[PDB]
Design a protein around this nucleic acid. Sequence first.
DNA 1: TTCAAAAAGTCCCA
DNA 2: ATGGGACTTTTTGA
Length: 545
Amino acid sequence: GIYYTPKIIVDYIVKKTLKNHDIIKNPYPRILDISCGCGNFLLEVYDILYDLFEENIYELKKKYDENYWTVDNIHRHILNYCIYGADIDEKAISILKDSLTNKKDESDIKINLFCCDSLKKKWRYKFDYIVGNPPYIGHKKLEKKYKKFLLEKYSEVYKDKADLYFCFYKKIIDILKQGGIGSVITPRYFLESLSGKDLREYIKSNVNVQEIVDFLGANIFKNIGVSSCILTFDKKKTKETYIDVFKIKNEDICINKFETLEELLKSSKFEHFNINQRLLSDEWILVNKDDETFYNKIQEKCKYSLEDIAISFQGIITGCDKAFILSKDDVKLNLVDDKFLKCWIKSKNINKYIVDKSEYRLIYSNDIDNENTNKRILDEIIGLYKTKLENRRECKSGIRKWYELQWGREKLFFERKKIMYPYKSNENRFAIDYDNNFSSADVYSFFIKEEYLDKFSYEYLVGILNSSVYDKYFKITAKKMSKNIYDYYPNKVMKIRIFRDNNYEEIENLSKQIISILLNKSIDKGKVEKLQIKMDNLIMDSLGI
DNA sequence: TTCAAAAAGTCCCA
DNA sequence: ATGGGACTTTTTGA
Ligand SMILES: OC[C@H]1O[C@@H](n2cnc3c(NCCc4ccccc4)ncnc32)[C@H](O)[C@@H]1O
Ligand SMILES: [K+]
Ligand SMILES: [K+]
């Protein structure tokens, strides 16, 4: 329940907020961490503040009460007026209280530490500086009773499949003083995700974003499966609204290459570019000028989107795959009439242009009429998981029978020629499915609308969609999930724009040559690459890049 | 009635 | 033991 931020990142975040504080003008800054834990950030804040006061102690002594401003009084002053923390964990607060006390009895020094829920606490005043690492909890792992509170009181940033850390962004922004500075490390996903749309709008319209450090898929928290970014923002009145963006170039680097994070940011391991906050739409397209030019050329030249021409759908969700998915060689399939059996593939079965042969079968149990006619299937296959099946939401409410698929969709959508792609991948992998393949939600499908069949063929679409141009084009705005993994979900895949011009026939012909080679017995994988290079050239010519 | 989003992923191995 | 690679379920709000 407690996560330790790497020291190099803590120091960078504390420096980002305090390095230019004018302690002579304001010797009473309020610095807050609302998920302080054991004080990873606040103990560093103490050290930075102590040097700031000690370095200017005689100037403060002359300007203000000369009896109050002594070196011996710095410790008490910092704890009384400067450092604030909050955390839900009582033990963590107790440890941090001891650590702050031991930085140096008399009249006991009051320490501004609150054991509370920071999202419910009535905050009695605003703060100059806010730093830290909020909790990340998604829609599956968040308690449903608590979600009702968030859906009611944090509706500006929290809806649907949003995350708990969205609300910490809102709370931090709301209690930041005018002219104050906030700097936090959170997951990166809100920068592109559909769930983060309202959160992005709230940030854009209430603070100036000074800086975004985007580590992409790099592993910042050891043994933790999350991807991180650092956001620095302020509430200063300024006419300029440009964001510094530092995007890592190599996801494999060790974060401790130099003594400081800023050395790494200035190095060749990162790229830097600027983004005008006023030009942010509901989506934040954070790319350099070359990629922006590349992206805008494709957007302006393409007159159609996939959503215009195609029908998208998520795959089957059985609710318990072990109950319904069997190996095609499993002897228990002899109990199942073939009318109930469907071919079943996983995301790893999707290559560019074609799907591997299926190794698994789905029992489409929705077509089982009653429990008496097919008792052996129920007793010997599906019923082996009956307890877990009955715990599915729609079974408890009586919507589904215990042996039915939870979301069986429409068979007719799958039993047709269609394009399939994995939901998470390192590259564009769009394949024509010829074999009426079914799949779980790790594979998405679409088919072309009837009225667009004379303009776009399946063979033409997989040709451009698998090209190097469209791989780079999709990843410009794609949701980066982990190292070498992007989400390929319809909320972004169906926004891909496509074109139709004089190169259509040759692109389509090259695609059919590739498909014909890939479907042979002795695949000339080499020839396919050459044909792909030729198609990439045609596509680059068509789009004027 | 029934869609589609969601990595403090999950699991294994050298 | 850890860090890195292959691979991806079903719960959930709307
Ligand atoms: O690294 C994460 C750190 O953040 C702390 N923390 C977690 N949730 C907190 C919170 N409100 C949400 C309560 C909450 C959380 C989950 C479910 C229901 C309610 N208010 C303050 N601090 C919090 C953890 O102690 C840890 O030290
Ligand atoms: K004085
Ligand atoms: K990561």
